[PDB]
């Protein structure tokens, strides 16, 4: 994940919804499981830490991630993927024959 | 006294059976474009006369390769094979198979097998069509589509088994419905129908699609099967008559409660009757979802991936088709990233 | 930064003891509103209803965990994401969220927090006044105060039938000067009663239910009252009566029962003879608004009572026009009333009770924007009634600081304006001939 990042309005949304403060749990099978026992799991090595917890939920419906920019060589800002987005028009498609079919109204 | 009826099937988008089977990485091999699932069988006789066979036994031994020992194609390549006459079939390659390059990185590792009979021909089975064809008539069905529906007498809800009867009652006379509505299978089709898709999930908060690790053997977009159905009483005539506009009252209410939360180009559009048939299509094309609703989330609710909210629509791709209607040219996506509600058919049910 | 980032609900009481609730909107640069919502009514035929719990183990069924729950897990999901400065496409999209035109499924209560703490943190965000942002530019009239100061009918057991009386001091220099004369007039009103044996404790309003001898005691101590505190009365202070015939209106003989609250002795009025008494009241003593004189129902008797008395006297519609867009429209095409009272939880939204008071100026009618009984400390409309030019307001007695927040909130607005500020007085009834 470069070409994009993490919007302003979803960490801002984050961070005053308090959603970090109520973080689930969980042990290797993807159930939930206290903080003391995910603690004692990831201490004993049954746990991985990285993957085993959950930032709550954020509300609102928000856009989570903007366009991420970069210089070109002129030194102008740009949009990580707008110019690299694709080089062939993929050819395609297929026009299948199929008079012979009753449609719905 | 019997009625029989025709049903034509047209996949509008992928349409994956399994059998609980998975292909791995060291069983196909992708080369020339093209995906090829030879017979192990085959492979290890000629495997045998080439004094390979302890090579080969201990690269499929191996429980743990590192990153490339797990593809069939680096064993082909070390050690010089240049046959490719194992048998078994092959898969066109369609490019959206896997979202990263499938002969790079960990890529494709496991695929899901469809379905066949002992002659390896796939087919679809009646009992997948007739738990779609129940899944629509008790969803249209006032009195089997309510409350009473809900076994709550239980440490969690489930279904309500008995509300439809079934079976015999002593003293009774025979009530079994479904005993008349019998949905044969389909005659085997061709392997030249089957594609690579993989699973993509579109979330409503997200608002973008994320790729998911379950690649699935499935029917192509515009693949026509042929069903039959008999039925042996007067209300299951009376309810096969009318699988149409069923169909459509179902899809109705489904497009009202799930399908309206997305982008409308993310949602295809109906030719004939809609369906929605194996696996992939979603929890609320198998459910009687108006009565589901709160309780198959909070089934989810203490696992890591957490249904939120209706859940996320599961859109697969595969190649973009138009067709040749009467009204024109129809597209079968109305989205540019080529984006299939997967799972989803029409049919047109005639009388036979 | 503009973005509505947090929206959220909590329950907290109002002025009388009873739940209602409280939203809280933070934006994305961190500007913050807080909107405080009155206490209501959750029954009504055509009045946009609120959301109460029900249970009577709890508040005695007055709770607002329901509404409360619908701002945060409803209202929230779908206004989180808008600009705070979009009032309207906010609002319009919480009423096509709920769906009911009496606002039923989410609670008229959950609507109007949520739109005053919208428009209070996108004020916040501009970094401009309350009433500048809701007004415009050109937010300069302060006002004129109706202060209830007697309150009897069904608020009082003495045996006066009318519910409130008020004092309108229309002949002040400034809205400072106009608090002053309201202020000094209820204490001496309180010094008047205290040498009488009258019980002096206030209501609900903040203003005396003392046991006077009728309508006619009360109100010759109102004029004793600004007398003594050295004051002329029709020319400096008015006098208003809010009479809410509509309690002691019986509707099958089709008549106006004043032996509900003034005894057998009482005299029983139809229409006619409740015009002529509403006449010679007005003849006899300074009264320049009366308030719901008629049955909400009685349109015959509303209209003639505006022919009779419209040019001279001002005739408020409380629950003859209920704060209903369509029934001001029905008074304005009948010529019934010259006068709406705009109750801001009545309606729901900010953005209907503009339109409301628009509607109402444009016909000449004069808009007075009112507190409620259970009031806060939420003092958001005043600047409603600043930001409109309304030129009116209803914001109760003198006394509780749910009235005196609003007349701070007032004086506050009148400092802030500075020379530009302007207390209109008598020309604020611009729906009286001269």
Known sequence: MKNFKISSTYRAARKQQKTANRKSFYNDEGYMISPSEWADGVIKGLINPKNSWSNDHVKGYLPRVSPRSHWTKNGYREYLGIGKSRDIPEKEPEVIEMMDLELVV | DYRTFKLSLLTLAPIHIGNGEKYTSREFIYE?????????????????????????????????????????????????????????????????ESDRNPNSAGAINEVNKFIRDAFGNPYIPGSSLKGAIRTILMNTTPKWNNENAVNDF???????????????????????????????????????????????????????????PLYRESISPLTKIEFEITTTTDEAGRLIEELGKRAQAFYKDYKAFFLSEFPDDKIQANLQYPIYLGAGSGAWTKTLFKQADGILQRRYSRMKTKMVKKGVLKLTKAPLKIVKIPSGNHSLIKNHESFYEMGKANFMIKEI | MSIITDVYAREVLDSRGNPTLEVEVYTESG???????????????????????????????LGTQKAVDNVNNVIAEHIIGFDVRDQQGIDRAMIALDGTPNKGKLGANAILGVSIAVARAAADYLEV??????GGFNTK?????????????????????????????????????????????????????????????????????????????????????????????????????????????????????????????????????????????????????????????????????????????????????????????????????????????????????????????EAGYTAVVSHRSGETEDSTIADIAVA?????????????????????????????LGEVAEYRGLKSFYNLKK
């Not at chain 3, 003849?283 to 004189?293: A, C, H, L, Q, V």
């Not at chain 3, 007695?397 to 506050?412: C, E, P, V």
Request: proline share 4%.
């Open chain 2, 32 to 96: 020339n474009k093209k995906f090829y699932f030879p017979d192990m069988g085959k492979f290890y006789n000629k495997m045998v006369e080439k004094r390979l066979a302890e090579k080969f036994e201990a690269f499929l031994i191996q429980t743990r390769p590192n990153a490339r020992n797990n593809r069939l194609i680096s064993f082909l390549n070390d050690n010089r094979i240049a046959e490719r006459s194992f048998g078994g079939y092959s898969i066109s390659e369609t490019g959206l």
């Open chain 2, 154 to 212: 239980g440490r969690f809800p489930k279904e309500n088994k008995n509300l439809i009867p079934w079976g015999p009652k002593k003293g009774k006379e025979y009530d079994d419905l479904f005993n008349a509505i019998r949905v044969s299978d389909s005659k085997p089709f061709d392997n030249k129908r089957l594609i690579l898709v993989q699973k993509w999930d579109y979330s409503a908060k997200t608002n973008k699609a994320k790729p998911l």
């Open chain 3, 31 to 61: 500007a913050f509103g807080r909107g405080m919502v009155p206490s209501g009514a959750s029954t009504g035929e055509h009045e946009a209803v609120e959301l109460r719990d029900g249970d009577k183990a709890r508040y005695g069924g």
């Open chain 3, 129 to 134: 006044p309350l009433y500048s942002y809701l």
């Open chain 3, 141 to 361: 009239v302060l006002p004129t105060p109706m202060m209830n100061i007697i309150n009897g009918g069904s608020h009082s057991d003495a045996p006066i039938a009318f519910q409130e009386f008020m004092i309108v001091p229309a002949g002040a220099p400034t809205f400072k000067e106009a608090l002053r004369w309201g202020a000094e007039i209820f204490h001496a009103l309180k010094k008047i009663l205290k040498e009488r044996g009258l019980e002096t404790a206030v209501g609900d309003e903040g203003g005396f239910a003392p046991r006077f001898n009728g309508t006619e005691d009360g109100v010759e101590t109102i004029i004793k009252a600004i007398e003594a505190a050295g004051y002329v009365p029709g020319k400096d202070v008015f006098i208003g009566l809010d009479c809410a015939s509509s309690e002691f209106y019986d509707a099958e003989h089709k008549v106006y029962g004043y032996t509900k609250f003034e005894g057998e002795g009482a005299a029983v009025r139809t229409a006619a003879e409740q015009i002529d008494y509403l006449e010679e009241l007005v003849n006899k003593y300074p009264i320049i608004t009366i308030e719901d004189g008629m049955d909400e129902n009685d349109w015959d008797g509303w209209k003639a009572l505006t022919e009779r008395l419209g040019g001279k006297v001002q005739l408020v519609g409380d629950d003859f026009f209920v704060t209903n867009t369509a029934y001001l429209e029905k008074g304005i095409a009948e010529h019934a009333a010259n006068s709406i009272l705009i109750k801001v939880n009545q309606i729901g939204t900010l953005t209907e009770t503009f339109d409301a008071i628009e509607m109402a100026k």
């Open chain 3, 388 to 416: 409109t030019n309304a030129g009116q307001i209803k914001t109760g007695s003198l006394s509780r600081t749910d009235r005196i927040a609003k007349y701070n909130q007032l004086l506050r607005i009148e400092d802030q």
